[PDB]
Amino acid sequence: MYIGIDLGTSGVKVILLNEQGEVVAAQTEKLTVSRPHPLWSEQDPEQWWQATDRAMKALGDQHSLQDVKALGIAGQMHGATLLDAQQRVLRPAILWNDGRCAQECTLLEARVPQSRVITGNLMMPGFTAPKLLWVQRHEPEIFRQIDKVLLPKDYLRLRMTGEFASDMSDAAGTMWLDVAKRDWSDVMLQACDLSRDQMPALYEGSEITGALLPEVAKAWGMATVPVVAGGGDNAAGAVGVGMVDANQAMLSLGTSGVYFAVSEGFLSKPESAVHSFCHALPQRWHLMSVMLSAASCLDWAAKLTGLSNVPALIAAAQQADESAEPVWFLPYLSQAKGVFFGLTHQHGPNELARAVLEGVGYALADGMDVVHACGIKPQSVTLIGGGARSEYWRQMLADISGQQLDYRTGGDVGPALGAARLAQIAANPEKSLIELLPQLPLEQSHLPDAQRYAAYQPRRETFRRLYQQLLPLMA
Amino acid sequence: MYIGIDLGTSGVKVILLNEQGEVVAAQTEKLTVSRPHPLWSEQDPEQWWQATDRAMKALGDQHSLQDVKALGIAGQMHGATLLDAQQRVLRPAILWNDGRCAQECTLLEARVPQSRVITGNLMMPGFTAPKLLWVQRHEPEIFRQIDKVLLPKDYLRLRMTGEFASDMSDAAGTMWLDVAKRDWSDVMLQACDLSRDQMPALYEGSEITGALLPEVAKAWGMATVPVVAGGGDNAAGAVGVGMVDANQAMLSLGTSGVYFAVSEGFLSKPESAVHSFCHALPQRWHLMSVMLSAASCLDWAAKLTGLSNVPALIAAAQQADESAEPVWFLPYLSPQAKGVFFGLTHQHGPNELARAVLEGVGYALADGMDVVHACGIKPQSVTLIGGGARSEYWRQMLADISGQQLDYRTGGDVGPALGAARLAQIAANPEKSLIELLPQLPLEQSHLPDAQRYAAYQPRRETFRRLYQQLLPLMA
Ligand SMILES: O=C(CO)[C@@H](O)[C@H](O)CO
Ligand SMILES: O=C(CO)[C@H](O)[C@@H](O)CO
Ligand SMILES: [N+]
Ligand SMILES: [N+]
Ligand SMILES: [N+]
Ligand SMILES: [N+]
Ligand SMILES: [N+]
Ligand SMILES: [N+]
Ligand SMILES: [N+]
Ligand SMILES: [N+]
Ligand SMILES: [N+]
Ligand SMILES: [N+]
């Protein structure tokens, strides 16, 4: 028996994994988000906890615990949690999707011209370091009282164990990590006027950080089980799925589009949207990129076409007629807008639906290509989330992208599964890592049709040209 | 009684008019088109005849033609029929929608610097003259044998009468005609290595060119009746609709979109996409421009939005969310039309979409008319006909957008065959006035521009034009 916790943005999910890969029980609790001025996105750590606590007990009361040998954590990345010397919350956490600190990203990069090299990343307002420059510039009374900065999942760890600890995948997201070295950068820390004194200790995701406190273990109906370092949600997710070694990758077709690809050692393209982090396992790194959200776009397209749903939209796409010429659908994730180009008399809601599917696919494919151009070459890609559910569209995507696309079972549990697996790892020291990294069961595999792939390439050239030409119009 | 024949592209139509000018009977026969190569559009002139024969025979079953007093023809314009000295058909007819001779179009304009001045037109591959340069250049063996070049309806005439003749409206479409002078242009003909001897005799539409041959008359159950010159399909259509004097104008929102306006004498502004020809009546001239098929668009906006019928649609659009930002529909006129939906957001469903189509087609049509008007046409009203014209809502929208009074009438169904018959009427009743014999169709409803909605539309028209231009190069 193992426990995985995921500290999400919309809420907390906790699971119970069996000695096998089976999830036995699951509980979920909602979080709210706060927005007290513009570009601000905040939560309070206490609510993180109260929800987590609440969840573990819902969990306890659904199935028996105390068979549990280990517990792992995951969470939303990049969140600044500031603690005073008593371990009291200095101010509400500043989240990944907070945008207050643009000017500070600038200064930070100016103070450390080698920052892109050290971190392997473009500085963003949602990353941790610049948030801290912001506090010191604006909330100095608060800045002066800082004893520690934790990432959100590591706040939970504190409450859970009394230790200050992170994993490499999360810490990588602070911009205080030397990603190549898997250790803090004194240069980056100083420039924010901080020291290692104020960082948590660094672990690999599979490593033990401590154990439940007696109190907490009592509250929860279980022993002082060991707690592992865990990961950031995307990495922990990938661990869950089995995407753990070089050139393995997964594409998320849900509400929150992401491509995640394990790299052959550390790589970077620091002047792009391609970010590079430690994985939540020893000796691994990954790339990742925000994408077109397929699920969002299909939802909208459904309404736009008047087909009132996605399954209906996909169904209709299948009915489109094959002698009609290509229409091009151009989606602009940027504020969720679009263009149909090349409409003729031969184009009904069917044709229109096909064009939506193809154009989302055109975009997804190009997004993947961008990652790959950084030095990743997948043998296949694993497909998760709501838009992965159609057999027709999986095949389209493979034909367009030229990737073998894998659909697996259980791809849908989220980072919590990864956190649980990490626990299971640490609890089986006798076995090698490589005997301990299950992939999810292969439910269907989609190889690209060579003719269809070839016919799509020129359409993709056309897509790119049109997207490019109209972009400044839709902006 | 009277007969009108319309030699179309996709079929022939014959009609029987009574003394009072009503259609008493009609008959249609289908035609195929042959496309041996990309950009080639051809028909066998023999198929024109067999189709016309069939049709007239069928007509006669329905009703005796023994009391017909005159006969008229109209036809698909610009078709090149090449005959030898024995009236042998030398090759298949190269039609108006053939695009094989673009190069020749340029060559011709280079050769005859004043060509746009003489023809009143910019040279198009659909026009007759460049077609003949192409044959000269690509089929010299054929060219060597040319005795006669006939437009399609005029080949029909020869088969019916044994005469070689055309009218000013069809002849204008050759690019060999001096449109100002209503006579062939030696300059234009020479430049193609042709002479007047290779052209038919020219008439006005309403003049008699001959009579049915006995064998033909007999086969069709009629007298050796007099035959008028007729018109090209557009001009003949206009005559049927009563479009007849300077600044009369019609907009056909049918399966084939046209704006047709009778001008004050001859008007030349070629630089441009307005065409200028002779009208099928004496001392009459006209401008024309291909337009969107508002009909074949409205139908599409319907099925597109999965709306059922042209009034489902027109109704969806009125449920359009006022607070929604605009979707922009940009329809690009090639029949062939290609469209863009620009600026779609979360706010948009089928109601919005349907609104966008109406307004965008509207915007296109208004700009289309403006261009023609800028040439020197000033209508008191615009006659509005065709299946596209059926919606009251849209007709008004069109008026609001355009600033133009739109007169809705019924009965533009019949087509060029009507005008053809009207022409025969004229010739057969030489004492009667055109006022008498060429009435307007029934006025159904007159749409005046709403001053408030017109003003509201103007900035949208400006915006449309801006956007349309921007994407224009992308539509090739
Ligand atoms: O549109 C025009 C060209 O002037 C008509 O000629 C039709 O092409 C058929 O006659
Ligand atoms: O992936 C990251 C970090 O780059 C964030 O946690 C968001 O994706 C949450 O949706
Ligand atoms: N709460
Ligand atoms: N044990
Ligand atoms: N400062
Ligand atoms: N279906
Ligand atoms: N009469
Ligand atoms: N055909
Ligand atoms: N063609
Ligand atoms: N001559
Ligand atoms: N006779
Ligand atoms: N312009």
From Swiss-Prot, chain A:
Keywords: Allosteric enzyme, ATP-binding, Carbohydrate metabolism, Kinase, Nucleotide-binding, Transferase, Xylose metabolism. Its EC number is 2.7.1.17, 2.7.1.-. Catalyzes the phosphorylation of D-xylulose to D-xylulose 5-phosphate. Also catalyzes the phosphorylation of 1-deoxy-D-xylulose to 1-deoxy-D-xylulose 5-phosphate, with lower efficiency. Can also use D-ribulose, xylitol and D-arabitol, but D-xylulose is preferred over the other substrates. Has a weak substrate-independent Mg-ATP-hydrolyzing activity. It comes from the Bacteria. Sugar binding is accompanied by a dramatic hinge-bending movement that enhances interactions with Mg-ATP. PROSITE patterns: FGGY_KINASES_1, FGGY_KINASES_2. NCBIfam families: PRK15027.1 (NF011601), XylB (TIGR01312). Homodimer. The gene is xylB. It is an enzyme of class 2 (transferase). GO terms for biological process: D-xylose catabolic process; xylulose catabolic process. This is Xylulose kinase. InterPro entries: ATPase_NBD (IPR043129), Carb_kinase_FGGY (IPR000577), Carb_kinase_FGGY_CS (IPR018483), FGGY_C (IPR018485), FGGY_Carb_Kinase (IPR050406), FGGY_N (IPR018484), Xylulokinase (IPR006000). Changing residue 6 to A: Loss of activity. The record marks 6 as: Important for activity. Belongs to the FGGY kinase family. The active site is at residue 233. Substrate binds at residues 77-78. GO terms for molecular function: 1-deoxy-D-xylulose kinase activity; ATP binding; D-xylulokinase activity; protein homodimerization activity. CDD domains: ASKHA_NBD_FGGY_EcXK-like (cd07808). It catalyses: D-xylulose + ATP = D-xylulose 5-phosphate + ADP + H(+); 1-deoxy-D-xylulose + ATP = 1-deoxy-D-xylulose 5-phosphate + ADP + H(+).
